[PDB]
Amino acid sequence: TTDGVYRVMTRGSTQVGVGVMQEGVFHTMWHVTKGAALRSGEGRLDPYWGDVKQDLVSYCGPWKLDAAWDGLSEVQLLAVPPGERAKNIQTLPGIFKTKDGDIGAVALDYPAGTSGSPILDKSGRVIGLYGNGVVIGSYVSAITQGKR
Amino acid sequence: VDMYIERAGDITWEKDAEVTGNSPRLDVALDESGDFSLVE
Numbered sequence A: 001t002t003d004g005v006y007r008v009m010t011r012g013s014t015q016v017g018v019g020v021m022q023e024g025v026f027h028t029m030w031h032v033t034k035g036a037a038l039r040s041g042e043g044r045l046d047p048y049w050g051d052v053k054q055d056l057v058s059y060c061g062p063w064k065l066d067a068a069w070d071g072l073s074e075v076q077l078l079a080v081p082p083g084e085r086a087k088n089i090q091t092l093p094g095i096f097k098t099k100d101g102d103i104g105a106v107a108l109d110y111p112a113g114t115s116g117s118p119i120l121d122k123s124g125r126v127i128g129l130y131g132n133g134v135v136i137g138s139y140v141s142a143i144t145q146g147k148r
Numbered sequence B: 001v002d003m004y005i006e007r008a009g010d011i012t013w014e015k016d017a018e019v020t021g022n023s024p025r026l027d028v029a030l031d032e033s034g035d036f037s038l039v040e
Helices: none
Strands: A004-010 A012-020 A024-029 A039-041 A043-045 A047-051 A055-057 A074-081 A088-091 A094-098 A101-106 A119-122 A124-127 A133-137 A139-142 B005-007 B025-030 B037-038
Touching: A012 A124, A012 B005, A055 A074, A074 A101, A094 A139, A133 B037
Parallel strands: A039 B005, A094 B025
Antiparallel strands: A004 A012, A004 B005, A012 A024, A024 A055, A039 A043, A047 A055, A074 A088, A074 A119, A094 A101, A101 A139, A119 A124, A133 A139, B025 B037
């Protein structure tokens, strides 16, 4: 329940992804859990909202993250790769240009178990999650943010 | 299948973070299955 970034594990054990706990809601990407219930301690986190097109899912309540990239500043990926300590990677995002507007995108390539790691602005607010993107051989992840 | 979570740290901006990566500008399309694809 505590605020923070979390690893998403499955059972040996394997880290399949990452998520963000904020205001009592766990946020991660749909392709990490497919909406399956999550265990935390002796408790169970049930899914509340999910959307395959946005590739997002929230547990225990509605999506709470609403900060956005300002389009000009450097951001930081708080990557939590499997078997490694949480680390911040600063970068200047590129841009996914779509017919429905522009989306920030980071040209950083980390192991698949890092999907769901938060991207932060300078104030420390989560502006999106890492792990849905395109290949240009170099992988580029959209900064995926939900709607609160 | 036992899916569970473990806390890995605080959500915090770090001043001594490693800095890398470029900033490509790309035309993409997003389909109904959440997959982005390149567009020409």
